[PDB]
Design a binder for this molecule. Structure first.
Ligand code: ANP
Ligand code: ANP
Ligand code: LBY
Ligand code: LBY
Ligand code: MG
Ligand code: MG
Ligand code: MG
Ligand code: MG
Lengths: 258, 258
C-alpha cells in the first residue's frame, strides 16, 4: 500500500526536479528508471559535457573576457600557508583541514596561492592586477545538505586601482545575472555575503585588511569566492548538493545507480 | 668574468626556449627580466589563458567532438580502490601513494573511477561506451625532471564494440597530430607506450585484462592515459617539467620571480 520511507528515498534518488499515488513501488521505480536512462542517453547523443566542467569553462570565459588572468595553482599546499592565513586552533577552519604527510595539506581555499600571485605579478603587470582561479578545495564538514568535503571554488580578485565596494558589487551582479542565478548581496575590512535565500553563494571582501601584510601586499583590493556546486545546485534546483559534486553516484544530477 | 654556476642557474630560470658572452651577469639578467615581464604583459593584454587550463579545454573539445562523455570524478578516493586496482606492496606505486586520514588517499590515477563509470553506464548507454576524464593525480616521486608529484592526467576509454588495437592507435594518432606533438607508438592484455624520444607521453592498453573482473566489467575495451604537463613540456620545449606544472613559480612557462 503506502510506500515505505526506504522506498521513497529510492524514488527520490531517481527523481528529477522536472518530473511531475495509485501504483506500486515497482511501477513508480520502473518509470523513473526509464526516464533517467533516457536523460543519460540524450546527453550522450548530444552535448556530452559534464555540468561541473562546463560551468568552469563558462565562468573562465566570463572572467577572461573581463580582463582577469586565469591561474592554475597547487591544490596540495604547504601546511605553513594555513597558519599564515591566520587560521589557528582558535578558528573553525582549523579542524576542517585535510593534512597530507607532515608538511602539506589539501587547500581549503584559494586565497594563499592568489596572494602569492598578486605579489609576484605586481612586479610585471600594469595596475590594476586582475586574476582568478577555479579549482578543487577541501574541508572536513558535518553537514551534507549544503556542504561537500570535496568542492570547487571560484575566487577572483583585483588589486590596485578601482578596488571599490561598488565595483565589487557590480562584478558579482553581472556575473550572477550572466549565469541566470537569483541573489541578494548582504553586508553593512568590508565583508559581504552573496545569498540565494538562506544559502551562501559567496563571501566577498573589500580590502585592504591586516592579513595582507603577511603576504606582502600593501595595496587596496577586492575579491570574492564562489562555490561552483552551490551555483549548480541553485541553477538546476537540486535538492541535495551531492547531485552537483564530483561523484560516481550522479552525472549532471542524474543517478548513475540504474 | 665567467658566470658562476649559481648565476647560470638564475639566468636559465629566466631563459625561454625561444631566446637566442661579453657582458656581466647583471646585464644579462636585466635583459632577460625585461623580456619576461614583456611576455607576461602580452599574455595579460591579449589571451589571459593559463596553458594547463587551455590544454584541458582543447583536449575536452577533441574527445567530446569524437563521441566521448566528459567525466569529473573524485580526486580524494577510498584507499580500498588502490588495493582493488591490484596495487600491493609488491609494486612500485604502493609507496608512491599520498594517504589522507585512515580511509582515503589522493588518486594516483584515473582508472578506478573510470571502471566504476563504465560499469554503471553500461546499464543505460548504447554500445560502445566512450568516456574520458582529465584531472589532478598524485604520486610521490624521486625524479623532478620528468615527474611532478602533482600532475594532470587525461584518460580516455571505450568499452564494447570497436575495441581494437587499430582503433586505439588511430585515436592516439589523430589526437597527437591534432595537438601537433611528435610521437612513436611502441609495443609488440596488450600494452603500448606512446613515446616522444625517451619520454613516455602515454601508456595505453587493449583489454580485456584479468583486473576487469574485480570492477565488474566483462567486455572488451581500449584506453590510454596521457600526462598533460608532459604534453606541454614537449609542445613548448620546456627543459624542466616544472614550467608546465600548477605552480606559484612559473606562469605559462614564464618565471614569476622577476
Ligand atoms: N564545504 C563546502 N562545500 C561546498 N561549497 C563550499 C564549501 N565551503 C565553502 N563553499 C563555497 O565557497 C564559498 C567561499 O568559502 P567560505 O567563505 O570560506 O565559506 P564558509 O564561510 O565556509 N561558508 P559556510 O560553510 O556555508 O558558512 C562559500 O560561500 C561557498 O559558496
Ligand atoms: N609523476 C608524474 N608526473 C607527470 N606525469 C606523469 C607522472 N606519472 C605519470 N604521468 C603521466 O601519466 C601517464 C600514464 O601514467 P602511468 O602509465 O602510470 O605512468 P608511469 O608508467 O608511472 N610513467 P613513468 O613514471 O614515466 O615510467 C604517463 O605516461 C605520463 O604521461
Ligand atoms: C584576495 C584574496 C584572494 C586573498 O581574497 C579574495 O580575493 N577574496 C576574499 C574571499 C574569501 C573567501 C573565503 N572566505 C576565504 O577566506 O578564502
Ligand atoms: C579502462 C581503464 C580506465 C581502467 O584503463 C584505461 O582506460 N586505460 C589504461 C591506462 C593505464 C594508465 C596507467 N598505466 C594506469 O595504470 O592507470
Ligand atoms: Mg564553512
Ligand atoms: Mg563565507
Ligand atoms: Mg611512474
Ligand atoms: Mg606507463
Amino acid at each position: 500500500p503506502a510506500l515505505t520511507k526506504s522506498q521513497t528515498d529510492r524514488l527520490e534518488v531517481l527523481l528529477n526536479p522536472k518530473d511531475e499515488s495509485g501504483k506500486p513501488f515497482r511501477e513508480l521505480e520502473s518509470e523513473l528508471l526509464s526516464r533517467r536512462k533516457k536523460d543519460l542517453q540524450q546527453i550522450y547523443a548530444e552535448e556530452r559535457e559534464n555540468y561541473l566542467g562546463k560551468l568552469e569553462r563558462e565562468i573562465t570565459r566570463f572572467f577572461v573576457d573581463r580582463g582577469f588572468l586565469e591561474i592554475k595553482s597547487p591544490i596540495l599546499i604547504p601546511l605553513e600557508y594555513i597558519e599564515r592565513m591566520g587560521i589557528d586552533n582558535d578558528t573553525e577552519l582549523s579542524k576542517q583541514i585535510f593534512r597530507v604527510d607532515k608538511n602539506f595539506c589539501l587547500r581549503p581555499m584559494l586565497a594563499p596561492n592568489l596572494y602569492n600571485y598578486l605579489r609576484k605579478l605586481d612586479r610585471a603587470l600594469p595596475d590594476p592586477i586582475k586574476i582568478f582561479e577555479i579549482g578543487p578545495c577541501y574541508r572536513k564538514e558535518s553537514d551534507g545538505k549544503e556542504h561537500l568535503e570535496e568542492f570547487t571554488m571560484l575566487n577572483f580578485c583585483q588589486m590596485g586601482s578601482g578596488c571599490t565596494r561598488e565595483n565589487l558589487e557590480s562584478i558579482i551582479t553581472d556575473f550572477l545575472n550572466h549565469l541566470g542565478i537569483d541573489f541578494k548581496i548582504v553586508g553593512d575590512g568590508d565583508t559581504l555575503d552573496v545569498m540565494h535565500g538562506d544559502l551562501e553563494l559567496s563571501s566577498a571582501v573589500v580590502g585592504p585588511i591586516p592579513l595582507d601584510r603577511e603576504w606582502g601586499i600593501d595595496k587596496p583590493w577586492i575579491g570574492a569566492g564562489f562555490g561552483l556546486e552551490r551555483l549548480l545546485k541553485v541553477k538546476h534546483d537540486f535538492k541535495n548538493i551531492k547531485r552537483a559534486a564530483r561523484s560516481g553516484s550522479y552525472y549532471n544530477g542524474i543517478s548513475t545507480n540504474l
